[PDB]
Structure formats: C-alpha cells, structure tokens
Structure 1
Amino acid sequence: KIKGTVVLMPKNELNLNAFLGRSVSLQLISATKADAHGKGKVGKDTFLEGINTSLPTLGAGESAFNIHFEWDGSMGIPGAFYIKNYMQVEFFLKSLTLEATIRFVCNSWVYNTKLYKSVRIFFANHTYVPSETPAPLVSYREEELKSLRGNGTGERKEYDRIYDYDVYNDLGNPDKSEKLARPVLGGSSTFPYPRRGRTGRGPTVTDPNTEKQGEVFYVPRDENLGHLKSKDALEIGTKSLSQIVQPAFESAFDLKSTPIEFHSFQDVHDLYEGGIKLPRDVISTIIPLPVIKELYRTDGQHILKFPQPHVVQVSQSAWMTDEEFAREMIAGVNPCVIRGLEEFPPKSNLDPAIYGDQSSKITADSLDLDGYTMDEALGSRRLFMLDYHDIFMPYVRQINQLNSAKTYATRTILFLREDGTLKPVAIELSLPHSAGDLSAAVSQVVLPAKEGVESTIWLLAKAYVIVNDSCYHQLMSHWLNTHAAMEPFVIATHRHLSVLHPIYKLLTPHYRNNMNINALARQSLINANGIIETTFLPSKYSVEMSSAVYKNWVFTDQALPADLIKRGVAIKDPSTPHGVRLLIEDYPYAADGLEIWAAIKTWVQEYVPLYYARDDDVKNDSELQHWWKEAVEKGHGDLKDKPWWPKLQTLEDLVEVCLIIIWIASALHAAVHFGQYPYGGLIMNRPTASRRLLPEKGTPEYEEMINNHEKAYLRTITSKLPTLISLSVIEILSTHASDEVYLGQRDNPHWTSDSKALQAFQKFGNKLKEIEEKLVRRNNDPSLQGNRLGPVQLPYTLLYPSSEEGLTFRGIPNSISI
C-alpha cells in the first residue's frame, strides 16, 4: 500500500468529517506502466480515510487527510492522479504527497464531479519538455491541454477552466444607452489592441458586436484567487467602489451636504488631517464593506479620513517646486516617458494640414540653461523633454468639445544641471487649429516664474502637463503596457504549455491574479462610465486612446535596455556592467531597474540551459512553438505583421522572450503601480483632469489667477467629487495584499523536483536580497539626495524587491496582481 496525504481547504476558509466516507476519491496514474494503448495504467478509486493531525507545519486554513492506495510495484511509479469530488460544495485541493517521496502541487478548485466533462487530473512535480514526457503520460498531457483550450464557443461558467481570446467589445453598455456605446478595441486596423480572456456571454440586444453585461466577468476558475483574509481581496474593491461607494458619494453632492468644490489647498489637505464630513448614511454605506472600510479612518458617524500621502509626509508644499516636478519624471509614478532631445526646436510628425503649423514656439534664447548655450546643452546631452505633443494633439479637439474637459497637447523641456538634477525650463501648451474653429484659444509657451501672476500661469502650465502625464501613465504606462499587454501571454501559456513544461513553471508565477484584476477592470475600471472615464480627462475617449498608442507598442522595446536607448536617456556601452550608460547618471527608476533587470536575466539564463541544450531543442519543442505562435498571431494578433517579433528558434530568443515577460509583469508593473497613492494621493501633485484652458486677460478668470491662485488652480484640475473617487481607487491599488508573492518567492517550495532549478531559484532570491542592500545604500547616499529623495524627501523604494503588506511604496510582486 502507498501511504498518501491530501491537503485541502474547505470552501468556507475563503466540517472535516464530510470529506470522509465516499465523498472524495483519487486514482493514481502510472508514469512508467501503460495499458494496451500506451496510456498510464489507472488504479482503483480510493477515498479519503481520515483527518491527519501530525505535522505542525500546516497553516492557511488547510487540513490534511490520510489515504492509502492499492498499488503494486508492477503498476510502475505513479506520476499523476485523477480526483472526483462527490460532495455538493467545491473544495480547494492543495496537494498530494506519496511516501516511499512523490509530490503533487495542485492548488486548484475541485467542483462536484457531475460538472466536469472529464475528470480532474493532476501531475507530479517533475518537469519535462514534450520530448521528455514519459511515454505513458504523453496522451494525458496533450488531452489536458486540449481540455484547457475549449472549442471557442459557449458561455463560460464559474467552474470552467477554459482559456481563450476575445477582443475588448465588453466595455460598452449600448443596451442601457447609446451614449454608453464604445468602439470594439482589437481586431481592426483602426483599433488594434491586445486580446483578453474570452467570457462568451453573448451579444447585446442593440449591437451584435458588443458583448452583453454580466454580473460576474468570468476568468478560468483557478485564476480567481481566493483570500484567507477578506482585507486581501483588493481586486474586489474596485467593484465595490464603483457600484456601491461612488453612488453614495454622488448623493452627498446632489443633496449639497458638502461643498461641491475645494475652495483652497487646505480643503484638500483636510482629507488626510481632520478628514471630510459626510452624511451619516453615506458613512454607513462605506464602513461595513471589506477592503473599502480599510481605506479610511472614521468616527463611525460622519468622518472619513484618508491616509497621509507619502509625498507630503515631510513637506506638504514641495510638490509645487520645479525641482520635484522634474524629479518625478525620473523617480515618480510614471518615470519612463522622458526622452533625450537632440535637436532644437523639438519637431512634430503631425500633419499641419489638419492641426495647423506644428512648429514649436519655444525660442532657445528664452531658456535658462544655467549659462549653457543651446548647442552646448544639446551636444553634452543635457537636454531632455516630456513630450505629449504628438500623442495628445489628435485627441485635443474632441476632448475639448466635452463639457467639463479642456486640455492642451503639452511638451516640457528639461535641462540636466551640472549637479545632476533635472530642471524644467519651458512648457509649450499646444492646441490644434483649423479653419472655422469656434474657439479663439491659442497655443502658448510658458516659462518658469516664482512671483506674481506669471508664477500662477507657470503652476497651471505644470498642471496641464501632469494631466497629460497622468492620463498617459494610467492608460499607457500602466494599463496598456502591463495589464493588457501581458494577458495574451497568460492565455497562451495555459493553452499550450503543460503544467509539466519548464517554461510554464518559469513563467506562471508571474501571471498570478492578472486575468482576475483585468476582468474586474473591464467590468468597473475601463468600462463605459466606469471609474477611469468618470475621473480622468479623456472621458469616453480614454480606452480608445490606449488603442491608438498600442499601434506603436513594440514587444522588444519593453526590454529595459532597449527602452532606455530608444528614449535617448542611455546609450549602448559594452564597457559597462549592464551594457548601457545612463545619460542621467542618477535616474532612480533606470538605475535601480537595471539591477533588477540583470538579476532576472541571470536567473532566466541559468534556468533555460537546464532544459534546452542547443538552439535546435527550442525549435523542436512543439508546445513552445505553438505557444509563441499563438501568443503572437492571436493574442497580440493585430500586430502579427510587425518585423520585430522574436522568432524563438534559438536559446537566445527564448531567454529574451522570457526575460521581457518577467520584467513587464514584475518590476515594470511595480514601478508604475505602487507609487499611485504615494504620489497621487495629493490631487494637486497628480491631477487626473483639467477643466478649462488658460484665461484671457481682462476676464474675471484672469483676475482670479491674480487674487486667488489656489482657487484658480482648483477650478482647473479634477473636481472634488471625482477626486474623492480617484483617491479611493488608487489607495486600494497602492496596497500590497498580505498574501502577495514577491519576486524571488514562489507559492510552493516544491514547484519542481529538479534540484538544479531549485538551486538557481535560490540564487536569484539571494541576489535580490543583495540588490535591496545596494538600493538602500543609494537612498542613504547624500550625494544622490536630489533625485532619489527630492524636496519631498521621499526615498525611492519602488524597486526594493521586498515589502510587508500595506501601502508601502516598495516591493516587487511577481506579477500584475492589482
């Protein structure tokens, strides 16, 4: 008899005896002895015998069960097993351990046997490329993959484990209102877009191309992460905020129970100090909700108090400094858009026949480059820019036609001072111009000013820039480049790489909760009249703008070195450790990022060789080839015609592809995600919208700039209501769940039986700890204070590998998990 132990979690953990009797049966499958068809022999249905209470090591609401299998040596060595749950309620199977040791890491929900087309099968923790699969498991290996792919049809149900693709045609809500109709993103040259997980709810009544609404947006069952602690279900918070809290906030404003607008900057600071007083029933709607209740301190009656944002923890006014404005471009929430500027004036590739003369109005002689001439600044590579002119110009006219939205396509010129810090030297606020324009508003250039109305105009100019930046950051740097771009690879991986596959094991930890947060996002974050549309500048144009940007998305340019080189902030240099020399030496995001990038590169470079000896071995891996082909031709199908896609016929290519995927999912996402509330928790520092253009002299609006600059600023940026909603969502997002799995960690120490792979993973983890010590030394280095801390005195810790739970401003999760 083979002694076995089954560890599982009853549904109520997210009694024992109910699992005994004939409730749960398992059948071992042989990996060495096959029947007359080459398929591993199957043992007899074996039921759980009893509750085991021996080894202390057994937490997380887990329970262990004893079981003995009738298995003779003549049946070979078990390498897999079937399991059938005869109970009505599903349970979470953690693992099976056979002694005499064979391990099975399952971590999967097992629903009642009648709901499955085929019996749930689980494999032992061994790792095999297709050609190494023991012959008696080959068919079982391919059948499970076929099962995971489904047939492309049907409405997906909660227990389904079917991975497939579909376009973003589920954001609009045309059946509710024509105003909620949205273009389908993906599948057209007009709107290319990464694919998302297929749900199959069917067409809406008014539009066959739009998927009907659903109360629950399906994701393959095991992608929907349960949490032992409800406070850790952060992804569900977006839904509660949109469906329950937002309406409650709106009622307080409709009933005029709180001023509609912030009237001074102190009104904004009050949010995290004394707080904001709201109607009793409004507080009562919020205080009992899981996750939402953790967002604010309350007296339980009328007060909501937000946590003090990191950016104001030392100086509440430092965000207003030109120093901090520029520093956040290299160490802020969106540190990856700035580019080197090698010619002057900056040029535009936009059609002047459509937008009017696109020549920059910025004159070189007007800039203060600390004594440098323009030619000297250009040649010494000290000139940079945050360029949103070409990106935004195509949408300015339509955004500005909206009732409470007015923006400019902005461009900010930055000069790298001799002390190594960046200083903003001009901002161009551009507007498109065409015959027949009703508006008399014109483009203009604003220069730094510390006194008088000019200083107010310059402060407002910075605000229009950050509105451009916040939109680009949330929709492109964050949503498009991490969340959306990664989902196609998650789907392809489960569809074509067996759980036995080395690359599946290498990549899957980096997909944890990605499909889940994405599905919840399609439902409440990026949907018509969703959180983003109702809080950010572009309104109903928000998501389609990210499709326009995706036209220029390049997989290989996501690699950190390539990105730095492409943006002109670094140059290739073999004589350096990372192969690139930064043009801004103390560029926190880039410098810390290169360290993390290198650690991941080493790990992948050490792992791949363990399973692929030569290039031919990669070319001959059928699953790997089918995986990559599908990821590209279907997942990111609208760009399948591009030349830059790696071919994946070499070890080099496999390493590159895995390295980039891991980078995007871990460090890239953490860097653009966990600083949201730390930096944006003060709406003045990261405005999400602008509501009017600069005022004409001789108007009351112009007089206001002179007499009440704070009010002029507040009337221009995001209004108080959407601010409250936006602060709440980014507070939720910036929080690390206590059950997060960070880079250098895995959810199970037995994910593979291969000791060599396990040793390499341990080295990767040690290297990350080593890197963290180095980053701590950088933050403590006084010579780097200007860019790593700034006048806000906020140490750049976003790329520190580790973190405790909470809103910590540090820690790199393995995946896009929130």
Structure 2
Amino acid sequence: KIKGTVVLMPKNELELNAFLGRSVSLQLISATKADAHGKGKVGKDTFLEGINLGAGESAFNIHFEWDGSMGIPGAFYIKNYMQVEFFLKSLTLEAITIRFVCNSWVYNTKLYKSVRIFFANHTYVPSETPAPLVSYREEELKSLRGNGTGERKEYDRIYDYDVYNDLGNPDKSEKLARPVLGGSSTFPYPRRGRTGRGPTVTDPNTEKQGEVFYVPRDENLGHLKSKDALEIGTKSLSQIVQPAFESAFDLKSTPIEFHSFQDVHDLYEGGIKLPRDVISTIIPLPVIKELYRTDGQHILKFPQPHVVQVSQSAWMTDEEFAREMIAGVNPCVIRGLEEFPPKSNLDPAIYGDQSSKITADSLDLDGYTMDEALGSRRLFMLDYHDIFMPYVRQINQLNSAKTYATRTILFLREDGTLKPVAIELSLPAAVSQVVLPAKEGVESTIWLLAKAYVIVNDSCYHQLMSHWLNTHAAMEPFVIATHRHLSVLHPIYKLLTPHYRNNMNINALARQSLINANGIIETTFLPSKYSVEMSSAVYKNWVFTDQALPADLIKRGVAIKDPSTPHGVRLLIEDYPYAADGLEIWAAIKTWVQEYVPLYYARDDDVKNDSELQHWWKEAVEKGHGDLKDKPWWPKLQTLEDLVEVCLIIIWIASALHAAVNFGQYPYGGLIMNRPTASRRLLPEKGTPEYEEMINNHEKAYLRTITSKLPTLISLSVIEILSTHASDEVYLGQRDNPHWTSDSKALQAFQKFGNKLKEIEEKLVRRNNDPSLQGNRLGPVQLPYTLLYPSSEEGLTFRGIPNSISI
C-alpha cells in the first residue's frame, strides 16, 4: 500500500463526511509499466477513507494497493459520484514523495465524456515522456480542444477561438448593433474564447446575449473572500449600481453638473448625498460596498486619489501634465521628434493636407533654436492626430461629445524634465489652431482647456489601446493556444500558465459589461459606440515583437540602441520613470527565461522538434491573431533564441506592462479633472457667453468641457475596482504552489529570480529617494513612482506587479 492524502476545497468555500464512503474514487496510473496495449497500467478504484493546510482546504487519507508489478505512479483518474462539485487541489503519495498539483474543479462523473486525469509534477517535452504516459498526454490535449461546435456549459474545459461578435445587442435595439471585430481586413482583431450561445434573431452574425459568458471551468476563478471577486464587481456596477445612479439623476436628487472644482473634491471629502434607496442598493453588494465609505443611509464618499494627497491643485501645473507622459497611467505613447513640423501619414487623397501648422518661432525652447533642440534630441511629442482624425467627425455628431485630434510638442529641459511648448487642436483639410502656454488671462484658461483635450485623447487611447488591446485582448489568443497545445507536463506550459491567471475570466466579464454595446466604456468615454472599433484600427499596426520594452523605446525614438549600456539601450529622456524601472524588470525576466529554457532544450533542433511547441505557436498566430497571420515580423520557433524571445514578450505584457498601465488608474484618474474621459464642447468663440464664463469662472468652463457628473461617478467606481489588488493576487516572482515542478534546477532558478526582484525593489526605493530624480519621479504632486515595485499588499496601493492580467 501507498499512503496518499488528497487536499480538497468544497464548492462553498470558493463560490465533510459526505466525501467519504463511495463518493470519490481515484485510480492510479503507472508511468513505468504498461499494459498489453502500451498504456500505463491502471489500479483499482480506491475511495476516500477518512478526514485528516490552507484556509478552506480539507485533507483526506487514501491507501492504494500497489505492487512492484505496477511500477511508479505518474498519473491518476478520479471519479466524483457526488452531485456537487469540489475543487481538487492536490494528491501527495508517500512513494519512491510524489506530488500531483491539480487545482481543478471536478464535477459529477456523468457530466464528463472522458474521466478526469491528473499527472504528477514532472516536466517532459513530448519526446521525453515515459512511453506509458504518451497516450494519456495526447488524449488529454485533444479533450481540451473540443470539436468547434456546441454551446459551452459551465463544467466544460474546452478552449477555442471566436471573433468579437458578441458585444452588440441587435435584438434589444438596432441602435445597439456593433461591427463584428475580427475575421476581416476592415476590422482585424485578436480572437477571444468561444462561448457558443448561437446567433441573434435579427443578425445571424452576432452571438446572442447570455446570463454568464462562459470561460473554461478552471479559468473561472473562485475566491475565498467575496471581497476579492473584483471581476464580478464590473458586472454588478453595470447591471445594478449604474441604474441606481441614473435614476437619482433623473430624480434631480443631486445637481447633475459639477459647478466648481470643490464639487468634485467633495466626493472624497464629505461625500455626495444620494437617495436612501440608492445607498441601500449599493451597500449589500459584496465587492461594491468595499468601494466607498457610507453613513448607511445617504452619503457615499470615494477614497482620496493619490494625485491630490499632497497638493490638490498640482495636476494643473504644466510640469505635471508633461511628467505624467513618462510616469503616469499611460507612460508609453510619447515619441521622439526628429523633423519639424510633425508630419501626418493620413492619405492625401481622402484627407487632404494634414500638416502641423505649429511654427518653430513661436516655441519657447528655453533659449534653444529648433535646429539646436532637434539636433540635441530634446524635442518629443504626444501625437494623436492620425489616430483620432478619421473618427472626429463621427464622434462630434454624437450628442454631448465634441473633440479635437491633438498634437502636443514637448521640450526636454537642461534639468531633464519635460516642458509642454505647444498643443495643436485639429478638426476635420485639417482645420487647426495652435495653443501656446499662458500663465494669466483668458489665454491661461484656453491653454488649460487645450490640455484637457489632449488628456481626453490620451484617456481614450489608454483605456482602449494601451490597456484593453495591447494587454487584455492581445493575451487571450496565447492563453487558448497554450491549453489546446501544450500539455500540463510541458516545460513552457509550466513557465507560461502562471502569467495567464484570471485573464480569460476578466475578459468575458469585460465583453459582457465593459466594452459591450451601451456598457461602461461606451457610457463614460468619448468615442461611445466607436470605442472598440477604434482599437481595431490601431490593431492593424500591432507588431508582437515591438511589444518588447527595448524595441518599444527604440521604435518611439525615446531611446537609441547602445551596446555600452547595461541594457543595450540609452534613454534619451534619461530619467523616464516607466522605462528606467521597466528595463530593470525586463532584464530580470530575461535572465529567468534564459536560465529556464536551456534546461529543457539543449540545441536549436530540440525546439524545432517539439511538436507541441510548433503546433502551439502555429495556432496562436494562424488562428489566435489570424487577421495578422501573414505579417513578416512573426518569430518562427526554430532556435533557442526565438523561444526565449517569445516567452519573454508574453511574460512582459501579462505582468509588468499590464501593471504599469493598470494600477495607476485611480491614483491619477480618481480626480476627474486630471484624467477626463470625454470632452463635450469645442473651444468658445469670442463674444459669446461661454467665452466670458472662461474669463469669469474658468472652473465652470473646465467642468463644462469635460466628463459630466453622472458618467464621472461610474468612471471612478470602475477604475477604483481596476486599480485594486485582491488579497489572493500572485505577484511576479511567486507561484501559487511551491511544488509546481519537481525539477529542482528550475526551482533554484526561480528562487534566484524572486531574490533578484527583491534587489530591484530596493534599487527602485533608492531611486525614489534620490534628490536629483525627484523632478520626474515625484513631480509637483509629490507622488513617488512606485508602479513598478514588484511587491504589494492588498488594496489601492499604486505598486505591485501581478503575474498576469488579473484585472
């Protein structure tokens, strides 16, 4: 007999005597002894004996009869005869100890076509699999693929691709019809996980609405504390809290418009007085109640955002506006200008002349001439002109939406901080007006409004492109390809799967409540129905290999290749907080991947020879990012170096890149005037009442231009959810189970990686305490750039890099 202990979590802990008797049987499978058909020998049905660790877990003892004729166990089957599911965590066998790290829900046997199999934590590329286990490895992969047809049920573990044809709602109203994104050249898009609900009545090409948007069962993360189910909070906020708020505004219970900046600051100070019925709707809701402080019957107040914690006015400084382009929520769009004026790439034949009307002579480059500044590489720009100009006429025809496509020119001062020297506002021949900085008079308010247009442009780009497309949407193809093609035993599966946690789940919740027709992003952001459409337009230019941080910096002209530097790249904005810290994290991940991959792949031919690896990458490109499959820049996995690269970029996006652009959202955006999501008014003409209001009451002028009060309450609640780390978050350099592999050489290398992250955090603390770096790393708001610190505790911390796109 071999003694074994099975760790279980009953459903209720994540959503004992009953598990004993003939309720759960395991059957051990040999890794070293085959039956007369080549498969590993299977043992007798053994049941859970007696009750015998973490919270919610329950251990049970089992004893398997096993003889030397059967060899060494490497896998096991399990049949759950109970009516209710449970979460199987692990099995430990006191043999040879052998550990099977399962972490999987197993429903009643009759709900499965194949009996569930789990393998021990040994890592094997396909050719190194114990021959008894080869059949089992192949069959299990096949099972996870499914046959492409059918409506996905709760208990299914099937991974497949579909197009984003599920966001529109044509049967509720044709006004809610939306383009099918993906599968065409007009609208290319990454694929998402297939759900299979079937077509709508009105449109055979739209998937019909559903109560739950399926993700494969073990992608649907349970949580030991309801508090931590942040993902369902987006659903609750769309379906329950947003109605409640909207009724309060229909009822004129509160002013529908902010009139002064203090009205916005009140939200986190005294709160906002809402009807009792609204407060009673909010505070029973388990994730939603954690978002606000309330007096139980009338006041709701929001956390004070980090950006106002020292100075509640500093966001208004030109210094901060520019500083945030290299250390804010969206620190990765700024580019180096190498010729002046900025040029446009829009087609002359359709758009006419689209050239910057900014004149060099109007620019105060602190004493530099244009030629000097350009030659010294001190001119940078934040250019949203070609991105927004094809959409501006359509956006401006939407009620309460009026925008400009913007260009902002920045000069890098002798002290290393950036200076906004000009904002160009253009409307569809591009009608343009250049707004220069001004400290007093109407002119300072027009400059203030011009910065608001630039940040509406930036907010929309951050949410949709930097955040939705480049991390969430881009990563889901790779999650599906990994499960369909790389076995649980495969090294690269063990390396990659940690960086996928909760990604598919939050995306399905997002399609249902955030980026769906009339969802939260269309309600609170400028493009309204054009929002996800615009990210498709930007996806046309997505390049996977450009997602590598060195490549990104070089491509944007904010760094030059330089062999003599620790990272082979010399930053042109020397203390660019995101890049500088980012390069430290990047290098750490690179050393980890470079140590790991040679342990399983000795020569390049080994990579070429891995059938699973070749089918994984083939499908991720051909099916996953199918609309971009024939683009010349796709790596081919023929060498060790190619595999290291592909693994590195996937881990970078999931963790650090996603951290950098995600967790600073409420820190900086919680004050709506700092990060407005929409403009509603174009710039006032002289001689009209609104021009005089700019002069006499610049704050009402600004509040009139930006996101109205009700959209702001919804906007703030979502980005507060999005900026929160849950207590069950697994951070970079950690694993959920310490026995994720039995390979001690890989485990040692992982321990090194974790220690390297601790060293890097120390380095970063020192940078935050460096008096010369204060200008860009803290700025007028005095908020130390802690966004790329690897560790964090729970809550709205403005620090901590998760392993995955978990929110």
Which band: TM-score by shorter chain? over 0.9
Deviations 1:704-760 (A, max 9, x none): 111110001001000000000000000011000000000000000000000000000
* Aligned 8 A contact 2:354 2:430 in 1: no
The secondary structure found in structure 2 opposite 1:491 is: helix
Matched, 1:60 2:60: no
Q: Give the Cα–Cα distance (whole angstroms) in 2 for the partners of residues 105 and 600 of structure 1.
A: 24
TM-score after normalising by structure 1: 0.98
Which residue among 94, 97, 104 is the counterpart of 1:108?
104
Deviations 1:560-593 (A, max 9, x none): 0000000000000011110100000000000000
Q: Give the Cα–Cα distance (whole angstroms) in 1 for the partners of residues 183 and 54 of structure 2.
A: 47
My pick for the range that moved more, 441-450 or 259-268, is 441-450
Q: Give the Cα–Cα distance (whole angstroms) in 1 for the partners of residues 292 and 173 of structure 2.
A: 34
* Aligned 8 A contact 2:353 2:430 in 1: no
Deviation at 1:358, TM superposition (A): 1.1
* Aligned 8 A contact 2:15 2:222 in 1: no
Matched, 1:658 2:647: yes
My pick for the range that moved more, 236-245 or 356-365, is 356-365
Deviation at 1:15, TM superposition (A): 16
My pick for the range that moved more, 794-803 or 442-451, is 442-451
Deviations 1:367-414 (A, max 9, x none): 010000000000000000000011110100100111110111100000
Which residue among 87, 91, 109 is the counterpart of 2:86?
91
Aligned partner of 1:487 in structure 2 is: 476
Q: Give the Cα–Cα distance (whole angstroms) in 1 for the partners of residues 385 and 623 of structure 2.
A: 32
The secondary structure found in structure 2 opposite 1:97 is: strand
* Aligned 8 A contact 2:485 2:615 in 1: yes
Deviation at 1:703, TM superposition (A): 1.1
Deviations 1:659-714 (A, max 9, x none): 00000000000000000000000000000000011011111111111111000100
Moved over 4 A (4+): none
TM-score after normalising by structure 2: 0.99
Deviation at 1:356, TM superposition (A): 3.7
How many percent of aligned residue pairs carry the same amino acid? 100
Q: Give the Cα–Cα distance (whole angstroms) in 1 for the partners of residues 610 and 431 of structure 2.
A: 59
Deviation at 1:59, TM superposition (A): 1.6
> What does 1:339-488 align with in structure 2 at a 5 Å threshold?
339-432=335-428, 442-488=431-477
The secondary structure found in structure 1 opposite 2:231 is: helix
Deviations 1:766-793 (A, max 9, x none): 0000000000000000100000000000
Q: Give the Cα–Cα distance (whole angstroms) in 2 for the partners of residues 51 and 658 of structure 1.
A: 42
Deviation at 1:12, TM superposition (A): 1.1
Q: Give the Cα–Cα distance (whole angstroms) in 2 for the partners of residues 73 and 220 of structure 1.
A: 38
Change in Cα spacing, 1:698 to 1:356, as seen in structure 2 (3 Å) is farther
Deviation at 1:441, TM superposition (A): 11
My pick for the range that moved more, 691-700 or 121-130, is 691-700
Deviations 1:43-69 (A, max 9, x none): 0110000011xxxxx022100000000
The secondary structure found in structure 2 opposite 1:137 is: helix
Q: Give the Cα–Cα distance (whole angstroms) in 1 for the partners of residues 55 and 555 of structure 2.
A: 46
Deviations 1:394-450 (A, max 9, x none): 100100111110111100000000000001000000111xxxxxxx99421100011
* Aligned 8 A contact 2:656 2:802 in 1: yes
Aligned partner of 1:437 in structure 2 is: none
The secondary structure found in structure 2 opposite 1:419 is: coil
* Aligned 8 A contact 2:169 2:209 in 1: yes
Q: Give the Cα–Cα distance (whole angstroms) in 2 for the partners of residues 222 and 531 of structure 1.
A: 27
Deviations 1:615-648 (A, max 9, x none): 0000000000000000000000000010000011
Deviations 1:228-276 (A, max 9, x none): 0000000000000000000000000000000010000000000000000
Q: Give the Cα–Cα distance (whole angstroms) in 2 for the partners of residues 191 and 313 of structure 1.
A: 43
Q: Give the Cα–Cα distance (whole angstroms) in 2 for the partners of residues 8 and 443 of structure 1.
A: 65
Deviation at 1:14, TM superposition (A): 1.7
Q: Give the Cα–Cα distance (whole angstroms) in 1 for the partners of residues 464 and 238 of structure 2.
A: 18
Deviation at 1:361, TM superposition (A): 1.0
Deviation at 1:354, TM superposition (A): 2.9
Deviations 1:78-102 (A, max 9, x none): 0000001000010000000000310
* Aligned 8 A contact 2:411 2:418 in 1: yes
Q: Give the Cα–Cα distance (whole angstroms) in 2 for the partners of residues 314 and 354 of structure 1.
A: 49
Deviations 1:322-379 (A, max 9, x none): 0000000000000000000010011111134433421211010000100000000000
Change in Cα spacing, 1:98 to 1:141, as seen in structure 2 (3 Å) is same
Q: Give the Cα–Cα distance (whole angstroms) in 2 for the partners of residues 441 and 201 of structure 1.
A: 45
My pick for the range that moved more, 349-358 or 221-230, is 349-358
Aligned partner of 2:739 in structure 1 is: 750
Deviation at 1:74, TM superposition (A): 1.1
Aligned partner of 1:50 in structure 2 is: 50
Q: Give the Cα–Cα distance (whole angstroms) in 1 for the partners of residues 526 and 317 of structure 2.
A: 24
* Aligned 8 A contact 2:187 2:533 in 1: yes
My pick for the range that moved more, 442-451 or 304-313, is 442-451
Q: Give the Cα–Cα distance (whole angstroms) in 1 for the partners of residues 687 and 751 of structure 2.
A: 68
* Aligned 8 A contact 2:29 2:76 in 1: yes
Change in Cα spacing, 1:697 to 1:544, as seen in structure 2 (3 Å) is same
* Aligned 8 A contact 2:15 2:223 in 1: no
* Aligned 8 A contact 2:89 2:101 in 1: yes
Structure 2 gaps, min length 5: none
Deviations 1:10-30 (A, max 9, x none): 011129100000000000000
The secondary structure found in structure 2 opposite 1:758 is: helix
The secondary structure found in structure 2 opposite 1:541 is: helix
Matched, 1:82 2:77: yes
Q: Give the Cα–Cα distance (whole angstroms) in 1 for the partners of residues 425 and 27 of structure 2.
A: 69
Q: Give the Cα–Cα distance (whole angstroms) in 1 for the partners of residues 756 and 784 of structure 2.
A: 22
Q: Give the Cα–Cα distance (whole angstroms) in 2 for the partners of residues 526 and 559 of structure 1.
A: 26
> What does 1:222-237 align with in structure 2 at a 5 Å threshold?
222-237=218-233
Q: Give the Cα–Cα distance (whole angstroms) in 2 for the partners of residues 237 and 586 of structure 1.
A: 37
Aligned partner of 2:634 in structure 1 is: 645
Deviation at 1:156, TM superposition (A): 0.3
My pick for the range that moved more, 215-224 or 697-706, is 697-706
Aligned partner of 2:172 in structure 1 is: 176
Q: Give the Cα–Cα distance (whole angstroms) in 1 for the partners of residues 677 and 441 of structure 2.
A: 26
* Aligned 8 A contact 2:181 2:536 in 1: yes
Structure 1 gaps, min length 5: 53-57, 433-439
Q: Give the Cα–Cα distance (whole angstroms) in 2 for the partners of residues 777 and 798 of structure 1.
A: 14
Q: Give the Cα–Cα distance (whole angstroms) in 2 for the partners of residues 122 and 734 of structure 1.
A: 36
Q: Give the Cα–Cα distance (whole angstroms) in 2 for the partners of residues 420 and 726 of structure 1.
A: 34
The secondary structure found in structure 1 opposite 2:534 is: helix
Q: Give the Cα–Cα distance (whole angstroms) in 2 for the partners of residues 366 and 795 of structure 1.
A: 34
Q: Give the Cα–Cα distance (whole angstroms) in 1 for the partners of residues 262 and 68 of structure 2.
A: 77
Deviations 1:497-529 (A, max 9, x none): 000000000000000000000000000000000
Aligned partner of 1:195 in structure 2 is: 191
Q: Give the Cα–Cα distance (whole angstroms) in 2 for the partners of residues 238 and 634 of structure 1.
A: 29
* Aligned 8 A contact 2:499 2:803 in 1: yes
Change in Cα spacing, 1:543 to 1:686, as seen in structure 2 (3 Å) is same
Q: Give the Cα–Cα distance (whole angstroms) in 1 for the partners of residues 295 and 345 of structure 2.
A: 56
Q: Give the Cα–Cα distance (whole angstroms) in 2 for the partners of residues 633 and 441 of structure 1.
A: 39
Deviations 1:446-499 (A, max 9, x none): 000110100000000000000000000000000000000000000000000000
The secondary structure found in structure 1 opposite 2:431 is: coil
My pick for the range that moved more, 556-565 or 698-707, is 698-707
Q: Give the Cα–Cα distance (whole angstroms) in 2 for the partners of residues 73 and 807 of structure 1.
A: 56
Matched, 1:629 2:625: no
Q: Give the Cα–Cα distance (whole angstroms) in 2 for the partners of residues 403 and 355 of structure 1.
A: 24
> What does 1:587-606 align with in structure 2 at a 5 Å threshold?
587-606=576-595
The secondary structure found in structure 2 opposite 1:783 is: coil
Which residue among 769, 794, 797 is the counterpart of 1:780?
769
* Aligned 8 A contact 2:46 2:62 in 1: yes
